[PDB]
Amino acid sequence: ILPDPSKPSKRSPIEDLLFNKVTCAQ
Amino acid sequence: KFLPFQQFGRDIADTTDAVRDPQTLEILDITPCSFGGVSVITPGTNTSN
Ligand SMILES: *[C@@H]1O[C@H](CO)[C@@H](O)[C@H](O)[C@H]1NC(C)=O
C-alpha cells in the first residue's frame, strides 16, 4: 500500500493499477 | 495511402488536411497555426510594477 521506491514513478501498486485501469484534433 | 484518381481529404469540422498540386503530384498535410491566451503574473501593483 506504500510507495514502491524501485519504480521510477513514486506510486504504490494499487495506485499503479488505478492509473492503468481508467483511461484528437479537437 | 490515397486513391490516385481521388483529390483531397478532410477531417472533423471540415478541417481539411490534404491538397495536391495539379502540375506536380504530391501529398501534403496542414496543422493550424499556434495560438493561445497570454496571462500576466504580477504581485500587488503597489508593491511593484
Ligand atoms: C497598496 O499600497 C498603498 C500604499 O502605497 C495602500 O494605500 C493600498 O491600500 C495598498 N493596497 C492593498 C490592496 O494593500
Residues of B with CB under 8 A from a CB of A: 11-12, 15
User: B23-29: which pairs have CB atoms within 8 A and are 24 or more residues apart?
Assistant: B27/B2
CA distance to partner chain B, nearest, from residue A20 (Å): 29
Resolution for the entry shown, Å = 3.7
Closest residue to atom 4 of ligand 1, CA basis: B46
Question: How far apart (Å, rounded) are the C-alpha atoms in residues B34 and B49?
Answer: 30
Q: Is A26 helix (H, G, I), strand (E, B) or coil?
A: coil
Q: Is B6 a pocket residue for ligand 1 (Cβ < 6 Å)? A: no
Q: DSSP per residue over chain B, as a string?
A: ---TT------GGG----B--SSS---B---PPP----------TTT--
Place of cell 496571462: B39
Q: What is the DSSP letter of A3?
A: -
Among candidate residues B30, B27, B31, B29, the one with its CA nearest the CA of residue B2:
B27
Tell me the technique behind this structure. Answer: cryo-EM
Place of cell 498540386: B21
Residues 6+ apart with CB under 8 A from A2: A12
A-chain residues within 8 Å CB-CB of B12? Answer: 25-26
